Amino acid sequence: AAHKEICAVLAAVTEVIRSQGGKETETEYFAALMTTMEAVESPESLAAVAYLLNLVLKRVPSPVLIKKFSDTSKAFMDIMSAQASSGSTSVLRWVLSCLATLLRKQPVTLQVYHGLLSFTVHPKPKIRKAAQHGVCSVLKGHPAAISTAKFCIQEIEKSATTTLHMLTLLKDLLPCFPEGLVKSCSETLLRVMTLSHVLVTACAMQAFHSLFHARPGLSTLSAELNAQIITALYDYVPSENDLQPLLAWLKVMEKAHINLVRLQWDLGLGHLPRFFGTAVTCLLSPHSQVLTAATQSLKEILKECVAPHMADIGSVTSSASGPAQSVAKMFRAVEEGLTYKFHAAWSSVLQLLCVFFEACGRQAHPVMRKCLQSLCDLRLSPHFPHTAALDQAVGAAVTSMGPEVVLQAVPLEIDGSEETLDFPRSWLLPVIRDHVQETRLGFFTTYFLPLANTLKSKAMDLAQAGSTVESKIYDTLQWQMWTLLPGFCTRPTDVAISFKGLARTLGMAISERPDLRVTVCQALRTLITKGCQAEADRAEVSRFAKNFLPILFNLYGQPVAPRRAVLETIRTYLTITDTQLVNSLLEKASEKVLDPASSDFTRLSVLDLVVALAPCADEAAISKLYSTIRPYLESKAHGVQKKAYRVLEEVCASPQGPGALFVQSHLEDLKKTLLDSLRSTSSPAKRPRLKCLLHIVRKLSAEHKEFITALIPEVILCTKEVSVGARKNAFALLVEMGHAFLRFGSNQEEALQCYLVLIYPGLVGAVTMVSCSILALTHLLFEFKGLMGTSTVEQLL
Amino acid sequence: FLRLLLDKKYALPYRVLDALVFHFLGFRTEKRELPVLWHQCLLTLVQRYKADLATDQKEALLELLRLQPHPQLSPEIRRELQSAVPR
Amino acid sequence: RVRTKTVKKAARVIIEKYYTRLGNDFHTNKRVCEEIAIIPSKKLRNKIAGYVTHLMKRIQRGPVRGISIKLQEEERERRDN
RNA sequence: AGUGGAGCCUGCGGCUUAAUUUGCACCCGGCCCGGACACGGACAGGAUUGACAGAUUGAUAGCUCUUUCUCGAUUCCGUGGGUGGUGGUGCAUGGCCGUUGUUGGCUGGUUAAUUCCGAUGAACGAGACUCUGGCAUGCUAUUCUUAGAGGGACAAGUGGCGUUCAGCCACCCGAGAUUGAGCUAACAGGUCUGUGAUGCCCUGUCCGGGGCUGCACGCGCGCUACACUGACUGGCUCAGCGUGUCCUACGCCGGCAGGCGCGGGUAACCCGUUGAACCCCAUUCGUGAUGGGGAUCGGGGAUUGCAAUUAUUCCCC
DSSP states (O other), X not given: OOSSSTTSTTTHHHHTSSSBTTBSXXXXXXXXXXXXXXXXXXXXXXXXXXXXXXXXXXXXXXXHHHHTHHHHHHHHHHHHHHHHHHTOSHHHHHHHHHHHHHHHHOOHHHHHHHHHHTTSSOSOHHHHHHXXXXXXXXXXXXXXXXXXXXXXXXXXXXXXXXXXXXXXXXXXXXXXXXXXXXXXXHHHHXXXXXXXXXXXXXXXXXXXXXXXXTOOOTTTOXXXXXXXXXXXXXXXXOSSOOOSHHXXXXXXXXXXXXXXXXXXXXXXXXXHHHHHHHHHHGGGOSOHHHHHHHHHHHHHHIIIIISTTHHHHOOOOTTOOSHXXXXXHHXXXXXXXXXXXXXXXXXXXXXXXXXXXXXXXXXXXXXXXXXXXXXXXXXXXXXXXXXXXXXXXXXXXXXXXXHHHHHHHXXXXXXXXXXXXXXTTTTHHHHHHHHOOSXXXXXXXXXXXXXXXXXXXXXXXXXXXXXXXXXXXXXXXXXXXXXXXXXXXXXXXXXXXXXXXXXXXXXXXXXXXXXXXXXXXXXXXXXXXXXXXXXXXXXXXXXXXXXXXXXXXXHHTSOXXXXXXXXXHHHHHHHTSOHHHHHHHHHHHHHHHHOTTSOHHHHHHHHHHHHHHSTTSOHHHHHHHHXXXXXXXXXXXXXXXXXXXXXXXXXXXXXXXXXXXXXXXXXXXXXXXXXXXXXXXXXXXXXXXXXXXXXXXXXXXXXOHHHHHHHXXXXXXXXXXXXXXXXXXXXXXXXHHHHHTTSSOSOHHHHHHXXXXXXXXXXXXXXXXXXXXXXXXXXXXXXXXXXXXXXXXXHHO | OHHHHHXXXXXXXXXXXXXXXXXXXXXXXXXXXXXXXXXXXXXHHHHHSSTTOOHHHHHHHHHHHHHSOOTTTHHHHHHHHHTOOOO | OOOXXXXXXXXXXHHHHHXXXXXXXXXXXXXXXXXXXXXXXXXXXXXXXXXXHHHHHHHTTSOHHHHHHHHHHHHHXXXXX
């Protein structure tokens, strides 16, 4: 009942009682209670003052502590001597605690440290735990490390239940030790590994874990000493399947090998292949946890200890000498781990091969093909459950290795005329489709163009000969291997020289080959989306855009077709092209629209091309286009008005460039036109127009309130428009428009009150517009939540 | 407890009877549905101590019967009140 | 929109019996949906067409060996009758 | 291949028995308590309550048999074909559970160990039911009004996030990428102290001992054998399904049942490379109710349990 009180020692003693007399802190209380700690051995009152001085002592009286450390120390030695002669627990525990505080804050100091250290092997748990935590706090808060390390070594050498306590001591104190004492302790823990007891083994592996986990410097652990620990600790390998010490063994090996690689990378990579061989050998254990631990261990070692230093290693062949030969041994071990003897860990082994592919395929390509052939042979099993894992492995191998080297290793047997029709390597084309990202395009040309032409001709010849079964198979084959082009256009390295060899091919395949067209369009888009990083590449793409653009325009404008993919390709491929040909095509499209001898479908297609060409032109072309499209906003055709409003939205969409300059030059004319054409706007045309209005809100000046208060009812009636897109646009326009009133005045709340009282009459008129205005207030209430002012909200409620 | 202690049939003191009739007058204008056992308690009281009830107590229990009736046991209380010989 | 059971099981069986006559785009899927199955509900026919378009854009990216043996099995079943 | 033959064991009948329970229920003894209503009796001359000691008892005991000390209306005797209440049971009956997503947040002793016991919070969202609209310059008596049918939209396409598949977001086109109508509910699982002067039918606990097939017989499952394709003795060499904080390794003692100590195993880790039996090899036995066959008996030792007697079980002769 009294411990939980705020006035008790739980909270307030730690805060306000440390200020002894108003100033923190004074040890005059401590020095005044000497008459209680002398000649009085009463329990439960010594404990209380000991607890109080333990809590008070932490608030740094450091120069006073340095001065009267002798007084405190002699007081403490008489306290421990009297209490050890008496045999109590609580008073000893907090006098150990205040020893910890005093020695952390600060010849006789070694004596105080020895007195604190000597009570650790005391059989009472409360004395021992407090002594352990105190020594840990003193050392980590060092000239006293040698003494406590020698004490621990002699305590082990003299000695069966205190060994685990002082192994926990060594576990918590190994990083803060000098190198010779670390070597002596390593010898001592190996000497206790000479025994067969399990708990001492687990605690010594935990000590080695805490040593290798902290990543010690050169003064604590050297590379030679780490190598000696690694080679000396190989002697145990408990049996194969113990599962309690094996995980700790693998754990200290990964941490020791990581530290060895961090100290000296060539020596660590030299010692690693034996560790990989032992890991592969212990993958035969029947326990799944050993498999998971080994998988994670070898994966993280390959990710952190091998991959960043692989570029320094360079290319490796079959006749390597240095660490490249070590990498060859690494791969030899993990490839010998692909045999039949596992047959249950093949998912983990395939994960290891996949991460090794991703780490080192590009620099290990000469020697790394035999395992590719072996895993190709593994997929020929009648019932393989790791088909997805094997496919991911081949995908990583294609990504890093490159499909040219893979096809040198495992060639496709679909080269022209086959006697059978049961393709055993038909998964390679989906793998190459899914996982080519960084391979040269010239390989794709010189290997996949004539083969595609011959198989397509063979499919046509078999279709015209009556056989409709094999022809469909060959058509599916060729259509799948034409989908490799988006993969090869991901990050090409020679697209500055190899794109010239595919320009006319892609032109004819997009003109008179419909079955490829979408993919070709996608390929083009995919290329742009990650291929215009350099400048010569973009120059080549523009130089061929001057040829592709009439072809794409004629493809989109033809009567009936994948018009939307062509439209998206045209949009991006016009955003990456030069402005003069944009102006020329804009002139041609304006001539085609203004020509009265064109059909309605052709007119709408050329208006879509005008929509595409609008944001990429200069200010004069955009201005003359706006002058041409301005009478079209009052047209009775809903499609023409919709395309006109989409043009006005697209030219106002650019935040910078000629479009923004055009808007800044023609804002008044745009406002008058949009207010005049408000009376004659069709129902679909509301959906783009609001966005156009949105595109002139977020830079609207302060002298434009009449335009906004004229636009209010249109925005509300579009918040309850038929189309959900128009509703979303009107809601976003309301949010941005309320944001626009957050810039016209100093008081945000008053401005939003004005914005509300501009829309408050909407709760008065016709039933449908009342519902419209309630929906508008519902949307506005969720965005500017507190800024309306709750009482006003209450009135609305 | 009321029903069984009235079934004890002891010589009832009259302050006790005043307390009981004061309790039943306390149950005058309540609209809660009284149980069948409430009417059983009333029946036991008017069976045992009908002679010790004065005329005003008789009529007071009469409008207590009127406002809080029972389709089954109220006529029994009616005939016990109407055939009661006072002291 | 979430998916049901009947549309997709009907799509699965209609592929398992007539995978040869399907196409790649939505309109050909619609056309084979009228000309193969009666499908009195127009909503169900539209959903079947959408899911079979999803199936044709999904399975055509896979291995060709399974497609080839499935065409052999379908041609054998057609020739047997 | 047998069973039906023989010995033993067991299941139904039957026979004995106090009981040999039945389709711990059984038996032999000893405790505890067992309405009010009506009427007639005793009752402050005292109704009735508690009690030491001794004894009866297989044992002790104010729960009994003596001897008087106390408490006093808190009462106790008898007769009713009169109800009945700590009763059992069904119905209507009111409340209450479970049922048909998402993101956060240490005084004490004790152990190898942040080991053990011991004191000791928040928000966000929520029809996958049926029908169906926008646009038709199309068919029908038809671009402006009609009303039948046929189309059209299905997340179909794009880019991101995604277990790379379910799904999510945004966008182009498109009239339509979701606008309108109808549908909470349900308890054969129930629960919780309330309502009907609710229908019915009546007015045991603990303790000690025994028995639980005791055996003339009838009807049936089984085990072991009637031997030479065998019994004894030694040697040799092979499993599998499972289980285990009672399975057990190992060392010592005893000839054997078995004791003592010290380890492993919460388990493909230890028993356990499960060193099994038939079988194989070698010895003795010689057609003899015999070295085949083992029942029933006499003595001794050990183990499990409060307890082994009517033999719990095991070992030896």
